C-alpha cells in the first residue's frame, strides 16, 4: 500500500536584509547573520486544506526546535504564536484543528509564508535588528530566503 | 627556575559575569550576549613559564583561537596605553619559543571560586575585560567600575 514519506524538509530562514531567524528565550527574533550565529532550523510539512483554491500555494506546517514547538497565527489583531507539539501529531490532527498552523508557501528564490487561518495576514521581520517575528496585512520584510542544511 | 610548561591544550569557551561569551568577528575578540543561538569561540590554553614573575602573580598562561592558529598578546602599540591584540602564530610553536618571545602572550591566571582574572605579564596591572556594551571588542584596563567586566568563567566545550 503506497503512503506519503512525510519527510520534513530542514532548513534555515533569512530575510532581505541578511537578518537570520533564532529562537530567543521562547520566542523567534530576526538578527543580522554571523559567522558564531546558530540558525533556528525549521521543519516544514505538507499539509493538505479541502478548500483550497487551485491558485493557491502549498499548505505546510512549520515546526522549530527539532519540531518539538509548531508556528500558528490566531487572534484585535492576528499574531505569531508557539506551541508545544510535535511536527508530526500535528500532521495527523483534523482539519479544523490543523488550519490555525497552517500557512502557505510561494516560491524565484524568495518564499512568502501566507496564514490559512487569517488569508492576507504574512510571516514578516522587522527593519530593525533583535525584533520578533510576526505577521502583517501591510506591503519587502516577508520575501525569505530557505537554506536547507 | 624554569617550570613545567604544557604541551596539552585545555579547551573552553569565555564568558564574563555580566551575561556575554567570547566570539571572533571579522578577526576580532567581543563579547555578544549569552544566547542559545551563539557559536561561541573555543579557546586552547597552555600553562607556561616566567622565571622573571614575582610572587604575588598568578598562573602563567598562554591563550589560542581558531584551534590554536591565532595567539592573544598584550602590547603598546607611539600608543599611550596597552591593548589586547591577535598574532597569525601556531600556539604549539608559541611555547616552545624563549622566555623573552613568550611574555608579551603570557597571562596570569588568578582564580577566586569559579571566575577568573587575568593579567598581562607583559604590562602588569592591565586586565582583560570586556564592555558594559554588547559586540563591543574585547581589551585590556588598569580601571573598571564593575568586577563583571574582569571576571571569567572557563566552560568546558
Given at each position: 500500500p503506497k503512503v506519503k514519506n512525510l519527510n520534513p524538509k530542514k532548513f534555515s530562514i533569512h530575510d532581505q536584509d541578511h537578518k537570520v531567524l533564532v529562537l530567543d528565550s521562547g520566542n523567534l527574533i530576526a538578527v543580522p547573520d554571523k559567522n558564531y550565529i546558530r540558525p533556528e532550523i525549521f521543519f516544514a510539512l505538507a499539509s493538505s486544506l479541502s478548500s483550497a483554491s487551485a491558485e493557491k500555494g502549498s499548505p505546510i506546517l512549520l515546526g522549530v526546535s527539532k519540531g518539538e514547538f509548531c508556528l500558528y497565527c490566531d487572534k484585535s489583531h492576528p499574531s505569531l504564536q508557539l506551541k508545544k507539539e510535535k511536527l508530526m501529531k500535528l500532521a495527523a490532527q483534523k482539519e479544523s484543528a490543523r488550519r490555525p498552523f497552517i500557512f502557505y508557501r510561494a516560491q524565484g528564490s524568495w518564499n512568502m509564508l501566507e496564514s490559512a487561518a487569517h488569508p492576507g495576514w504574512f510571516i514578516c521581520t522587522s527593519c530593525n535588528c533583535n525584533e520578533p517575528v510576526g505577521v502583517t496585512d501591510?506591503?519587502?520584510?516577508?520575501e525569505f530566503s530557505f537554506q536547507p542544511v
Amino acid at each position: 500500500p503506497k503512503v506519503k514519506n512525510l519527510n520534513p524538509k530542514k532548513f534555515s530562514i533569512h530575510d532581505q536584509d541578511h537578518k537570520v531567524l533564532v529562537l530567543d528565550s521562547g520566542n523567534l527574533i530576526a538578527v543580522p547573520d554571523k559567522n558564531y550565529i546558530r540558525p533556528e532550523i525549521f521543519f516544514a510539512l505538507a499539509s493538505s486544506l479541502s478548500s483550497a483554491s487551485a491558485e493557491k500555494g502549498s499548505p505546510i506546517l512549520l515546526g522549530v526546535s527539532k519540531g518539538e514547538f509548531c508556528l500558528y497565527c490566531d487572534k484585535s489583531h492576528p499574531s505569531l504564536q508557539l506551541k508545544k507539539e510535535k511536527l508530526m501529531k500535528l500532521a495527523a490532527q483534523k482539519e479544523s484543528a490543523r488550519r490555525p498552523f497552517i500557512f502557505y508557501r510561494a516560491q524565484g528564490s524568495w518564499n512568502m509564508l501566507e496564514s490559512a487561518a487569517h488569508p492576507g495576514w504574512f510571516i514578516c521581520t522587522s527593519c530593525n535588528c533583535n525584533e520578533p517575528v510576526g505577521v502583517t496585512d501591510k506591503f519587502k520584510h516577508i520575501e525569505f530566503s530557505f537554506q536547507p542544511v
